[PDB]
């Protein structure tokens, strides 16, 4: 996958798909062309059958930024932007085939929440930094920024960063239940890799009837998981 | 001012931070028919009054709020007309959340002492949340041969884990402020003579914002708990673009 | 005497504490076809035995549950009728949270060791929960090749937050009592030495509610986590009231 | 003359609630909807009222909505809200929307609240919403969505054409449509069989019915018991 | 089968498990006897590879006249406040706990009087013909009662909701035809005819590979409870679950 | 779009966008290249100021007889998405109004984009039927759900269960499509209601037509918070 892509990098290594975001110079900013080459990236991974597992993270400094306000600014074509920021960063993403983990590396920021928690598993440098700064600028969070949040954050504090914009750490992040876990900067990679390759042992298809089920059943009531979580169970041995 | 306005609240703005203080302290800010009409009518004013930016939910004396008041909300209600019992109810919530969950303005219960029972309404329909290490909270209901009533027990399911909202609606134990934050009922605690100056620190940080935005963001928050990730990216881009207009 | 009553399970009664005991401890608790049908003969039995108001699930031996029998369970079903799978499964779930979520009588599970896979569901069924700090638990499913079955996701999904459920489930990895108690599984992790004394201590407290009045309390704070504040006012005012005639 | 824009008239326990802006085609303004508040909060108190028929004054049922700072919108929005739905959904009282000639756009949502409606077969409906520009607001669109098909729902609103009282009724968003010259008569046999009825154990039933389209069967167990007991309790 | 239970019989006619309410004297009323027979029965039936297709009928000139008032309260009051609570779950578990899901298909065959706590069953199963001459009512309003059990749901599923307001409201009567024409039932003939629709109904649905059909019927009821996203992983999971178990 | 793409065809005439599903030698069945290509379609369509209503209709006698009957595992949750982006995912909430006209056959995977599209107007002469169950499968992809919106509940399971066929005059009965009229006067009706749609302001459609099939997944209380916030959105739009 060398030079594929303007605004991203793919290295894999033993079944890792190291997914980079690179745009350093930006901070990783996330811009029309980073989303649509996103879309690309995931559904070639998708059926690439060297990557078993996808590992989301950023060059430089910066995990990412969060959405590109220059690079973002006909009513209509707000539409299809709109609809390429949620393809990759959750439509793909939230329920992708494959098990994902964001390795975030720095600054989190913003629209940077919803792939963050898209990605099933997370871990984090003590040293990122996060922040919902959305309310500073001006606006809401956009996109589905606030639902990420409701996943994994619980009220009180969703409401705090939210309402206020102010930034936390890594540590703090893990507290939260935002991330899995927060390790110093120099451990980051290796304790990531760990929990790839202890993913990459499982069968896949089973593993993403786990993964999509628990997802899925927070949605349900008891009753309507008797009936669904059978079905994943199911459908898992058809396939597997 | 709203100096002598009603019989069991006292409005105080101070910089655009309006203190609402429950006003009954001699029955430890119980909640009674009038306290729960009043307060309707407090949330209606302060929402049209562009002096409050920010409100924060207070009580006078020892107490914040003993919950709903024994004697007045039930004891002399529950044998009266059926209607009326349903209005009384009603006007409890109205206030209690109805207004106050998706209130237009930014609100902070500032919990300086005891909260039972129907005061877990408030203080969950109340964005964020300060407490003193000295307050202690109870679910007392279960000992008084009910079961929480009103929106207790889902503002218990909003803020407090499952295992831990079951123990404490089942036992009616109750817990100071320290271990209401742990549990996530509130956001801080606090000692009670650091209380004030922490809520009005975070109050100006909120009244920084641009309010319609502030608005937004906390109401878009609560409602898309509720709705699936395909439902939020309608319902949320809808209020960004609601909150651009406006 | 519930004494010699059923081949896979005993009941104790003890002042109005009755311990429902899974006992293959041979097999570490597996639970076999047999033992799910008998589970449900024990549930509705002591539903209806006013010498019973507080029921704690706990395990014969080391194991609290090993999980489904593997042998029983799965590879004999597997062998029978297509449709003989459908009574088995709907067996499963008929005492493991059917009956059991909604109990009319408060529950505690008693962790005294192995929890696994398909011992989750009944475990968060129970109302309250308290394990040994030795006690190991485990979704091992995955390593078995299968997705947790049954309720066991959902029985993650309301109790573990979202990150950590999706380790457990993805990694399959064990994890410990007081890791169970941190992550909102179980309320309390004790030294298995002192397990039962504080299960009782709790069991106890429960006996002193009206148990009419707990139900109501403790069935309307888990259906209230799957209505909205609007539907919930309703809902819980219904339960209320429902309780204030029984 | 309690109320400017809304006459109310009790006989033998039957409430007609006649919105009385007529010159207007009784159009919803702010101060209607906050007597209309009134109104039904008054109403509730009553012991002599046991049915409430909301109605028009001369020819409209009602023509929708008539048409300070940002902040006083949130105000009035609500207040129209308050006594179309809020209140009007699960009124303590049995409620009958009679609908006796022009029914547009906001109109839609009181309409829907109301338990039953019989409309005259002389009136006209629409969602005119689009024509003038703007989607339909407050709880007009949920109203169609509760009542008539998903196709005729889209059709009605997107195109904004209008209908008689016969396919009113056709369509599932009225209970009949009779003569003008019947309509208060065949109103009023509604009204009276309903009068005969237990009013706790009818706000329990028609509560009830409302909420369970909202749930499963599972959660519809426990609820629809505990509104049965809770009007053993009540009643 | 033949005369094991009290209150119900059981008639297998070569695919076609014909269940009868067997209390014509009291018009089908169903007892707390008759709950607890009707699951032995849903249990029995699920478990006989000889029932491909499950018919619920009458005995007599009723479908069922409702819930027994007389003996629920006789036995109810003979016991403690929990007692209650176990009647009304036997009545839940046959009405609709199995029956709605029920892994066979079900229909029912209405040839007279459906009052009340019928309308549960009625709804649970899947599909339903009536004759033109049986009168349907929710009665539980004159009786001075909400509709209990499920039926108000029952109604939520398959009549629009002016009508089941309407009926809920009034406790009016109302026939066949009416009944077929609210969606209530699939379809309304004279009752001369009855037999042969249903018949000729439950022998196309024979013709089908059970599981899936149960996957289908399953798969829909479900559906309408779920978001179209919901659905997209929820009915390819139904339909992957029927290759796996189709045989 | 002369000759862009190989399974469909473009014609738009005065703001009328006809999208016709072009494999009439197999019945318009849908295979995987027929979905990549309507993917691409709506997508194009969506971004041209010249269709202003997309109308939905098939070459032949069929509107579609539904999916056309691999590789690795993972292929088929390729080829599964691709179908349910145009049928539904891209279409249910599509920025422009949308109107089946089904000419003819009807079957199957067909009723997806049937229910996705806003209104519907079909042909007397046209048969659908729900033919999976006679081919050993329960519905696939959104299929009972399309049915679960459209048409009651005993009907639904009918139809479902029986996989019998039902002509033009049944559907519109059931509640499937809005009308039925002779198959001579197809493209004229659909074509006054396409032009009566062009007629509105196009941002104004969008949100009431999506507020409208979201307002039945929310409360009342959810509506009234989610149904201001859609006609607010659209006052800004414009
Ligand atoms: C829904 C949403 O996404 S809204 C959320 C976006 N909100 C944010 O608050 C991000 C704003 N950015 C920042 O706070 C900072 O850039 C930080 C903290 C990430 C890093 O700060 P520093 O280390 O001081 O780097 P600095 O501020 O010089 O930025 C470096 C470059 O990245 C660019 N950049 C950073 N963030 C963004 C962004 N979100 N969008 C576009 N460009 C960005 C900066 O403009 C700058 O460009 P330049 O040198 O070409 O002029
Ligand atoms: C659904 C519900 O909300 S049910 C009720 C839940 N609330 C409770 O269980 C709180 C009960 N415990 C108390 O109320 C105690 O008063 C405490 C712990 C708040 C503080 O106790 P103390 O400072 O020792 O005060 P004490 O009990 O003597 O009473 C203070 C005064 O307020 C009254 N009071 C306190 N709480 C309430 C209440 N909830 N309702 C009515 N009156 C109350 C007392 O009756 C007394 O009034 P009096 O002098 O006119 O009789
Ligand atoms: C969907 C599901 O529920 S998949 C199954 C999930 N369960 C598991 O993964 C747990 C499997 N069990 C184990 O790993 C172990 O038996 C432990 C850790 C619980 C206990 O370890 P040990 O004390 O070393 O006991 P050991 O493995 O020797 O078991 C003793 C007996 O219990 C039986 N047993 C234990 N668990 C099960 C089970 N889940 N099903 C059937 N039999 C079981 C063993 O097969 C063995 O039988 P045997 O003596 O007849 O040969
Ligand atoms: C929760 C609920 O289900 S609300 C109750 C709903 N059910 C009803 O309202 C049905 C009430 N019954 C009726 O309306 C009539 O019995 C009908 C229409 C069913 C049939 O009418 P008829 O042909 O005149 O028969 P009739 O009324 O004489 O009753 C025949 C016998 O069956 C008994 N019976 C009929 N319905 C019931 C019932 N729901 N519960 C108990 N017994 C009943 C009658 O009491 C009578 O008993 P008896 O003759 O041994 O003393
Ligand atoms: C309780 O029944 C089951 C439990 C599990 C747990 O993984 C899997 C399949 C089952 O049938």
Redesign the interface.
């Known amino acids: 996958y060398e030079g594929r892509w303007k605004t991203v990098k793919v290295e894999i290594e033993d079944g890792i798909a190291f997914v980079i975001l690179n745009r350093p110079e930006k901070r990783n900013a996330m811009s029309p062309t980073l989303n649509r080459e996103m879309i690309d990236v995931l ?1 070639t991974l ?2 690439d ?1 060297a990557a078993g597992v996808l590992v989301l993270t950023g060059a430089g400094e910066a995990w990412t930024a969060g959405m590109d306000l220059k690079e973002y600014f ?4 707000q ?2 932007i ?1 609809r390429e920021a ?1 393809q990759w960063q ?1 439509k793909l993403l ?2 992708y ?1 494959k ?1 994902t983990i964001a390795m975030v590396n720095g600054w989190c920021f913003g629209g940077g929440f919803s792939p963050l ?1 898209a990605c ?3 871990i984090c440098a003590d040293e990122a930094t996060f922040g919902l700064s ?3 600028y ?10 990420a ?4 954050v ?7 960063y ?5 930034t936390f750490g890594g540590q703090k992040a893990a507290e939260m ?4 876990e927060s390790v110093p900067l120099a451990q980051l990679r290796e304790v990531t890799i760990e ?1 790839a390759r ?2 990459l042992e ?2 896949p ?3 993403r ?32």
Not at 154 to 160: A, D, F, P, V
Not at 177 to 180: E, K
Not at 221 to 239: C, G, I, P, V
């Open positions: 559904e998708e059926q059958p006909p009513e209509i074509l539409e299809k709109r949620s959750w939230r329920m085939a098990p928690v099933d598993l997370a959305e309310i500073n001006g606006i809401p969070p956009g996109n589905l920024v606030s639902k949040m409701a996943d994994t619980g009220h009180r504090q969703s409401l705090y939210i309402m206020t914009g102010k239940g935002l991330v899995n929990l202890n993913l499982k069968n298809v089973v593993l009837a786990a993964k999509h089920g628990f997802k899925r059943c927070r949605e349900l009531t008891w009753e309507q998981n008797e009936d669904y979580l059978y079905a994943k169970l199911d459908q898992s041995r058809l396939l597997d």
